[PDB]
């Protein structure tokens, strides 16, 4: 059957099956997270120490694309860090232009769009890549949105993706998001990563966290150490 | 059969695996060995070159990009080649521009996007080289690798070629006392992790190796067969 | 037990299993159809050797020219295809006139060989001009020259690689003829040696009785440029042996 | 109705149990227990002039019973309920195998290869078993074939011959046979084991949000 | 397997499509090239009449320009454009530098153009092999051939085209000083030489000469006729 | 076979099996979708499934405005249905800079078409696997309700339907408007939802459906609360 | 063709007959036949754990070393698990003719493109027939019992000399009993693995070229 | 699947038995039987020139031209070069099914990548697989000797006028000899294809999908 | 382990490769010599077949001594035979010869595995005809047989008798065609090697290599 060689084509069935297989590529990654709660929006992802030799703060999958609003990904992570590229550039063009800080939900549409470009064109791959897009503004709110292979586009009150996406999913279903506060919330993440990480198939992980919110003034960053120690060591704790 | 799925780079696999991207990653293996490892105050590479033949000089495995970085290229001299130029002219930018030494961290980002553009499109291959770069800024002490996928690592130290996993296992369980080593311990326990990969037969010569240094004060340099002299005298022998 | 599906040999930009890339490997075999060629560097020199293989005796055996000169300092022997060897020839050329119009000086032997690796090595294709050739170029040159660093040869390939070597052959009997460069060389011989050595290893190899027709001989000194043996220098020689 | 998938689906989570018991504890449990049947003496004979059993007829210058070779009937004895186990097995596991195809479809066939790939191993193995079925009764028959012949033309030597040489070539086909039956639950266990998730799970869910 | 697209090589570095149009070239008329001592001689067979065909149409040697000439073997399509080019080339190149062509440079170009068809897929090699003829300015005789695959030579004397392999045998024993000596004797030796494989001598030889300082000739069919008889009357 | 799997060559037929496997993709998302038109009003109805809680209930749609007097509703791939969206947003409002006034629907429909036909007609891309249906109000035609499809056939309709109940829904429809007695809005409304309820058999709750609508006394596209939604869902369970 | 209103009449109650009983054959049938393939393999007589009980009493005389033979019956055993089994196996074979000509039924005028439902079809009919060809074999071997042991009782009546004989007739028994055994789990798994592709791949079966 | 310690004890037991025996047969047992297999092609015994010196006497009494026969025996020669053969192809046989089961342990998981080692895998299974079924072919042979020439003799002692029965008699004694001598030729050959395939290819043998390379994940 | 087990196994190989060259130096040559003069001897080419004929001595209706073999026949067979063995030993060793000259498994450049392949499929082809023509021998003897007895038992059917002369006149028109193909398979083996030497000998070639 030649009918899932290219992305032009069509199954006999109406399956475009290309897009499906690269969709099958972000399960091979490790899990990522992204709850949204009243105050603002947290990400996490487990990022597996494939080696000792690797520097900490390397292979980071938390992106910034631009002051407002933070970028996690799963799948290749070529393809995520050209993504980052693209929005990077389409959120400062719209600055340039409109004179303010891009809405998620049209940089959302826009970097959909452009995945969605390569989904229909023969010469060119659908991208590997799956990623989370998170922004608080005072305006606009906490925002979530999730951008698949195919350039579908959803916002999320609690978001998964990679290897442990349905078994996160659960977990996160059983929270209850909206009420709690964002210090709260990176405890939780923690626990859940904690929860999903197969120990006896992957080796070590190391915990990678950020979030936005007003407690930034609406900047996505980094959670300082102390904030992510007593995560993890809640996250241990609970694990039992 | 799934011959299928193998002829291009722009067809995925039914298990999400671009299998032309995993066969350009299988070139780096192909190259002769290189080691990195940095400490506090300097980054080095070192590498064993191979040569056609007796009478021909041992290729060039260590290529200098600035004064602040230089790489060391495992996989196709073509492709190498291709990408010092690349780097070169973007350092080159960076001075006439800003009047600053590009970072090293944004050197290799731009190096990623531009191997990525190959994998994604139909046409140009994978870039089927395996780089090591190395280099000192404000920051501090630098060592990347990058892979013919676009995908770059930061790390303490790190092999790439052919056997490098013996010389990554000696420096794994040797990296503690690399941060805080002098430049003549750190390059002294590159070569005894490079002289890991080699054949039991063969063993380290002036000729075969070829050390790089950069440092806060040392721009890169490297030393070539007769200055690695200094630093091999020191290794005592097989074990 | 025979396994030769190969399926990923055809085509460059298509990396086979294990990596190997076999388009360009084939392209370093075809050198292999090519005439013998061979390079000796020296303190008093290079000398560079190759024999012609003349089809039929009406052809002019002086239009074979498999030994040339990219300028005075640099000359070349080629073994592969004449044609993209022509090119690259032209290539080396128009590249030592531009470095003598832009810095007033004389290329190195290596920055000649590099240029011309520059232009093999685009049968990848990374660039986007049409005019470029999409097979690599079939052929490996020999580069002699004399330069700042005293006689210097230099050996490429149709990859773009590039390597100083002070003795190699190239072409169809380059296995063999190696081992023979291998015991025979060593550092200290003058060039009338290796002329005679060169001359000896092209006779073992060569299908034809040697004569001043079937070869080219060719050398370049310090205090000279790149000169060619003519057919009576050559018959002395030839008689020498 | 759905009546029928209800059953066909009680048989299903049957074969599922009972095929993960057998990967579990019988397959390993057999190997040990071939393994050590031909690490025993039996069956592990240095001269096969042991081996040779007595033929009655007389030389020329009506024959007594001729009975069949003790030694190769009690190994055979032994060795014949493992090969109907062996095969018993092979079954449940086929027909497990076959119960977890998916539905055909022209994308997402990995799993399902994966499975052909196990079923391709499985059918060698059940003709080479239900070949060493077919040897035995072959060694009965040509046994006495080969001792009629021999009897009704007791002059001829070579019918003598040929009766101990079908002998001793059963014993050794019954070694090569425990040792086939040991490898093949061996090599069954081996490649169910490293491919059970997909064999269990050959496609799953990747419609997603595609459509 | 490789011998489907110009750019792959096969295994053993074999690029198999020149060598398919070099065969295409081994199908057409025959063409012989002899260099005279002050004559450059260029004959070519002619395929048949028909009867009812003009033969002005049809005329295998062409002047590229005063003091240059070919003939050629293969498809007369590509032949024509080749001749084309190279005529446009000579006039660009009067005009760039003042001079006149030489034969080593317009057989350089048209090799250059054959090799540029090569190299690149999406175009096919031009099916021809040339026999370029001149006087250079010190006006030494200069034949050279070209071939699909786009390396020249200079020969002495050499035939393109079917029955290539026979004649130039015979031009191999054939040809000395001795027969250069007179231009009658080189257009002789080149009858013989077509005379060796063709049908019937007059009637199938379109013949011309190049003399020192004069344009194309191409001789009379009763100027051919009187050569013939010379040539079949000695034997 | 192969005259499939490439959308220029022709069956021996002359069929162009791609497309028709495009009309498949429309089906394969499970999802229904109706447009009935009125006397004064046209409305479209859609299924609207979450199938997670932890989607933005708010943030799926298939409806989307065009421009501030017309209404789409989409079927199909969600991506290609919001580029096809995006590309008759820019064809509205550059009829608007053009020409000086709201761009009709029957020419939006007509544009979309036929740059699906440049898709069909083209080699490289593939028609979008989404079908489009458009409501509005032209003052000279009353309410208008038309449809595209990838194939690039635009007609317009009295009522239609689209996805995977496409058949029992036009069967049920085509029966309704022989019947033809009127329809007001609130009957236009509930035609609709008894349509769509009735093939899918789901007796739908105010969240499973999305309603939008278009009416002569307000002619813009308004995209009705789940309260409204209610509102007529009880009235029809009510009678 | 013209179509004679008779002739429509038939071809029509033909085509409405054949799918009434497909439906009934895989709803109804189907299920009870597993069913009852699943009690008769727990009945005691078909899973007897010592095959040397179910060795038959052969009498004919040991010749005296150096009169006639009475008559020697059928082990009663294996023919009551034929007697059991044979049914089951000429059934299957029906059902098996039952659903091929349903399939081809179902199969659409030919046409260019839309053929992966042609495909599926042209897939599940070669399993059935797969199917079908495996039950021809278990007659086959059904039948070979009979003229196997006749021919091995016969022989060892004729050449009473030779106890190899005797020793094939008990052989050629207990290789019944497990062959039939076999069968008749193989023949649950045939109906289970019908079911299983049918009604997996039924939408496109039915309705193979779309709508 | 829940896996005893027990279970996890016996596969681990029955994996080491086999990969070390798989290396004491390569390394070990080949080269040996290699030496042994060409002293026995160099001995006398296999090395008979005149074939007709191995024509075994048929005592059956000639008719004349218008009694029983004796014990008639088998022919030495041949049945002792049997005697030697007959062990080593038995031996091919079970170390040819060792070797597959080796590989066949030696498989990796099935994945879409890296199939080049499993190719070389499972066409070197082929080759030996082929290997074996010749093997299964000679002992077949074997057998058909004795089988063919018992009837043989039995049909020129029935009918003692025909002469020819008793020239097939020698003649297959004769052919027997020559395809004996091809046999151990045969299994050297076959020992040494053994070794070459696998160790020319070991590597990919062994370790099927490589090294782990760096994540593109 | 085994640096020494692989020294037996390439002295194994040492030793097939100087046979091999021999063989094709020296006996392919003398042995194609031998069998077109064993052709053009008069034994092997008869004008008439009724000189062939060999007396059947059973006694016709209005118990036969021995019925001997055609001695004509037989001889001719007994020269026969050793070029049989001969050629099936040569083929096998260079058979064997190619087989261990076969490279390392090379995903590419396996085109001179390819030659080795089809010079194999020939030397295999080959290999199955003699085989052929060493069972024929026996076949001719058993028939012969079979057709003497059938004779002998029913001597009233004339039938056998052509038989039995009808299997000799076939068996000698066959050994004559075996002779010959004997000689072209010693021929065409020669020519196939001598041809395809090089790349049988090295099919990979020298790793040129430096492109890493």
């Known amino acids: 059957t030649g009918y899932d060689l290219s992305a032009s084509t069509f199954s006999p069935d109406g399956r475009v099956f290309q897009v499906e297989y690269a969709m099958k590529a972000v399960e091979n990654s490790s899990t990522a997270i992204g709850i949204r709660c009243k105050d603002g929006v947290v990400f996490g992802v487990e990022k597996l120490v494939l080696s000792k030799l690797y520097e900490e703060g390397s292979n980071k999958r938390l992106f910034n694309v631009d002051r407002h609003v933070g970028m996690a990904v799963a799948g290749l992570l070529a393809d995520a860090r050209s993504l980052a590229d693209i929005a990077r550039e389409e959120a400062s063009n719209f600055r340039s232009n409109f004179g303010y800080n891009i809405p998620l939900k049209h940089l959302a549409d826009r970097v959909a769009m452009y995945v969605h470009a390569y989904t229909l064109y023969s010469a060119v791959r659908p991208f590997g890549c799956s990623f989370m897009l998170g922004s608080y503004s005072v305006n606009d709110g906490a925002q979530l949105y999730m951008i ?87 996250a241990k704790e609970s694990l039992k | 059969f799934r011959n299928q799925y193998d002829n291009d780079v722009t067809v995925w696999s039914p298990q999400g695996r671009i299998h032309q991207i995993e066969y350009a990653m299988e070139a780096v293996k192909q190259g002769s060995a290189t080691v990195g490892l940095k400490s ?136 503690s006392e690399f941060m805080e080593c002098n430049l003549n311990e750190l390059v002294k326990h590159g070569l005894r992790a490079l002289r890991e990969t080699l054949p039991a037969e063969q063993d380290l010569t002036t000729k075969n190796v070829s050390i790089g240094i950069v440092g806060k004060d040392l721009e890169f340099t490297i030393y070539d067969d007769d200055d690695v002299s200094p630093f091999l005298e020191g290794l005592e022998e097989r074990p | 037990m025979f396994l030769t599906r190969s399926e990923y040999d055809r085509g460059v930009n298509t990396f086979s299993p294990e990596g190997r890339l076999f388009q360009v490997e084939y392209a370093i075999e075809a050198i292999k159809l090519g005439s013998t060629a061979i390079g000796i560097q020296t303190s008093e020199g290079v000398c560079l050797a190759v024999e012609k293989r003349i089809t039929s005796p009406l052809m002019e055996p002086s239009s074979i020219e498999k030994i040339v000169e990219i300028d005075a300092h640099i000359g070349c022997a080629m073994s592969g295809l004449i044609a993209d060897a022509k090119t690259l020839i032209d290539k080396a050329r128009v590249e030592t006139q531009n470095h003598w119009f832009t810095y007033n000086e004389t290329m190195t032997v290596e920055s000649v060989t590099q240029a011309v690796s520059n232009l093999a090595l685009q049968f990848g294709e990374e660039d986007a001009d049409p005019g470029a050739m999409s097979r690599p170029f079939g052929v490996a040159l020999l580069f002699g020259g004399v330069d700042e660093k005293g006689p210097q040869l230099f050996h490429m390939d149709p990859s773009g690689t590039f390597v100083q070597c002070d003795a190699r052959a190239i072409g169809s009997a380059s296995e063999g003829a190696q081992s023979s460069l291998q015991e025979v060389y060593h550092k200290s011989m003058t060039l009338k040696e290796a002329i005679k050595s060169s001359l000896i290893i092209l006779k073992q190899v060569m299908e034809e009785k040697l004569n001043a027709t079937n070869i080219e001989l060719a050398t370049v000194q310090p205090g000279q440029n790149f000169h060619m043996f003519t057919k009576e220098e050559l018959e002395e020689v030839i008689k020498d042996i | 109705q759905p009546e029928a998938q209800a059953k066909v689906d009680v048989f299903r989570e049957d074969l599922c149990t009972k095929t993960e018991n057998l990967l579990g504890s019988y397959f390993p449990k057999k190997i040990s227990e071939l393994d050590a049947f031909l690490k025993e003496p039996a069956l592990n004979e240095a001269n096969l002039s042991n081996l040779k059993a007595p033929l009655d007829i007389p030389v020329p210058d009506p024959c007594g019973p ?34 977890q195809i998916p539905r055909i479809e022209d994308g997402n066939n990995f799993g399902v290869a994966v499975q052909e790939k196990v079923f391709e191993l499985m059918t060698s193995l059940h003709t080479k078993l239900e070949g060493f079925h077919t040897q035995i009764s072959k060694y009965f028959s040509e046994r006495g074939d080969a001792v009629t012949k021999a009897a009704k033309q007791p002059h001829v030597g070579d019918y003598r011959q040929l009766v101990h040489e079908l002998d001793e070539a059963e014993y050794r086909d019954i070694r090569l046979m425990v040792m086939e039956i040991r490898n093949a639950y061996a090599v069954l266990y081996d490649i169910i084991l490293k491919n059970f998730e997909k064999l269990k799970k050959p496609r799953g869910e990747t419609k997603g949000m595609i459509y | 397997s490789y011998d489907r697209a110009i750019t792959v090589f096969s295994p053993d570095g074999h690029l198999f499509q020149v060598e398919y149009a070099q065969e295409a070239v081994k199908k057409g008329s025959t063409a012989v090239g002899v260099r005279g ?46 001749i084309n080019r190279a005529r446009v080339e000579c006039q660009s190149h009067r005009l760039t530098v003042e001079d006149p062509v030489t034969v080593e440079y317009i057989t350089r170009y048209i090799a250059s153009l054959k090799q540029r068809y090569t190299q690149s897929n999406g175009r096919r090699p031009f099916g021809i092999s040339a026999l370029i003829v001149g006087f250079d300015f010190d006006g030494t005789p200069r034949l050279y051939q070209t071939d699909p695959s786009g390396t020249y030579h200079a020969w002495k004397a050499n035939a393109i085209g079917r029955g290539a392999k026979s004649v130039r045998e015979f031009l191999e024993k054939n040809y000395t000083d001795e027969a250069i000596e007179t231009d009658d004797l080189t257009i002789k030796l080149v009858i013989k030489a077509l005379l060796e494989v063709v049908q019937s001598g007059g009637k199938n030889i379109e013949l011309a000469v190049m003399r020192r300082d004069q344009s194309l000739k191409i001789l009379n069919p009763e100027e051919i006729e009187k050569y013939v008889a010379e040539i079949e009357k000695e034997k | ?16 099996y791609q497309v028709e496997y495009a009309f498949k993709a429309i089906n394969q998302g499970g999802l ?193 609360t789940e309260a409204e939604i209610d509102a007529h869902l009880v009235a029809l369970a009510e009678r | 063709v013209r179509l004679s209103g008779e002739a429509r009449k038939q071809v029509e109650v033909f085509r409405q007959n054949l799918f009434q009983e497909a439906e009934e054959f895989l709803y109804r049938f189907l299920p009870q036949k597993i069913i009852y393939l699943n009690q008769l393999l727990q009945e005691d007589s078909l899973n007897v754990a010592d095959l040397t009980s179910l060795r038959a009493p052969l009498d004919i005389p040991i010749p005296d070393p150096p009169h006639k ?143």
């Open chain 2, 40 to 175: 506090k105050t300097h980054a080095v590479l070192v590498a064993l070159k191979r040569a056609q033949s007796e009478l021909a000089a041992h290729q060039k495995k260590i290529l200098h990009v600035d004064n602040h970085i230089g790489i060391s290229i495992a996989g196709l001299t073509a492709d190498a080649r291709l990408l010092c130029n690349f780097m070169r002219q973007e350092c080159l930018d960076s001075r006439f521009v800003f009047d600053r030494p590009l970072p090293v961290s944004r050197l290799v980002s731009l190096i990623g996007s531009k191997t990525q553009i190959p994998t994604q499109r139909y046409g140009r291959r994978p870039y089927g080289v395996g780089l090591l770069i190395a280099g000192y800024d404000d920051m501090g002490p630098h060592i990347f690798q990058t892979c013919p996928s676009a995908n770059y690592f930061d790390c303490r130290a790190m092999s790439i070629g052919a056997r490098s996993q013996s010389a990554r296992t000696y420096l794994e369980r040797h990296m």
């Open chain 1, 148 to 234: 698949d292979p195919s350039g579908v586009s959803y916002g999320y009150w609690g978001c998964a993706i990679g290897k442990a996406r349905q078994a996160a999913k659960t977990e996160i279903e059983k929270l209850q998001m909206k009420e709690m506060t964002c210090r709260d919330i990176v405890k939780e993440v923690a626990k859940i990563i904690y929860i999903v990480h197969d120990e006896v198939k992957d080796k070590a992980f190391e915990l990678e966290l950020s979030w936005v919110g007003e407690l930034t003034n609406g900047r996505h960053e980094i959670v300082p150490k102390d904030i992510r120690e007593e995560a993890e060591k809640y």
């Open chain 5, 37 to 82: 001592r002050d004559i450059v001689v260029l004959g070519v067979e002619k395929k048949s009449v028909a009867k009812l065909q003009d033969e002005r149409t049809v005329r295998k040697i062409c002047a590229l320009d005063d003091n240059v000439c070919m003939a050629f073997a293969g498809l007369t399509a590509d032949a024509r454009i080749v």
């Open chain 4, 66 to 99: 001729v009975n069949c070779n003790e030694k190769i009937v009690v190994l055979l004895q032994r060795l014949k309920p493992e090969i109907k186990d062996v095969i018993e097995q092979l079954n449940l596991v086929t027909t497990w195998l076959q119960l």
């Open chain 6, 1 to 16: 076979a192969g005259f499939d799997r490439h959308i220029t060559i022709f069956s021996p037929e002359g069929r162009l």
């Open chain 7, 69 to 211: 033979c009475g008559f020697l019956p059928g082990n009663e055993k294996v023919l009551s698990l034929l007697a059991l089994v044979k049914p089951e196996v000429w059934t299957l074979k029906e059902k098996c003719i039952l659903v091929i000509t349903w399939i081809q039924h179902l199969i659409p005028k030919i046409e260019d493109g839309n053929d992966f439902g042609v495909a599926i079809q042209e897939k599940v009919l070669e399993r059935v027939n797969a199917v079908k060809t495996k039950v021809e074999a278990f007659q086959t071997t059904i039948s070979k019992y009979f003229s196997e042991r006749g021919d091995a009782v016969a022989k060892a009546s004729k050449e009473t000399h030779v106890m190899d004989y005797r020793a094939l007739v008990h052989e050629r028994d207990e290789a019944a009993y497990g062959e039939l055994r076999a069968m008749v789990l193989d023949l649950r798994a045939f109906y289970a693995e019908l079911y299983h592709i049918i009604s997996s791949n039924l939408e496109k079966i039915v309705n193979p070229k779309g709508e």
């Open chain 6, 32 to 224: 229904t979708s109706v447009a009935v038109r009125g006397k004064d009003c046209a409305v479209i109805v859609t299924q609207k499934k979450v199938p997670d809680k932890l989607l933005d209930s708010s943030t799926v749609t298939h409806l989307f405005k065009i421009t501030e007097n017309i209404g789409c509703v989409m079927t199909g791939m969600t991506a290609d249905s919001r580029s096809q969206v995006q590309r008759a947003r820019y064809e509205a409002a550059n009829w608007k800079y053009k020409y000086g006034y709201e761009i009709p629907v029957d020419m939006l429909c007509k544009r979309i078409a036929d740059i699906s036909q440049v898709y069909t007609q083209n080699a490289e891309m593939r028609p979008l696997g989404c079908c489009m249906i458009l409501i509005g109000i032209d003052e000279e035609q009353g309410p208008q309700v038309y449809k595209c499809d990838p194939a690039g056939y635009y007609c317009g309709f009295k009522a239609t339907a689209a996805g995977v109940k496409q058949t029992e829904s036009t069967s049920f429809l085509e029966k309704k408007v022989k019947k033809k007695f009127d329809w007001t809005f609130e009957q236009t409304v509930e035609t609709a939802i008894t349509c769509l309820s009735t093939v899918l058999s789901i007796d739908f709750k105010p969240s499973e459906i999305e309603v939008g609508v278009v009416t002569v006394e307000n002619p813009k596209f308004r995209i009705l």
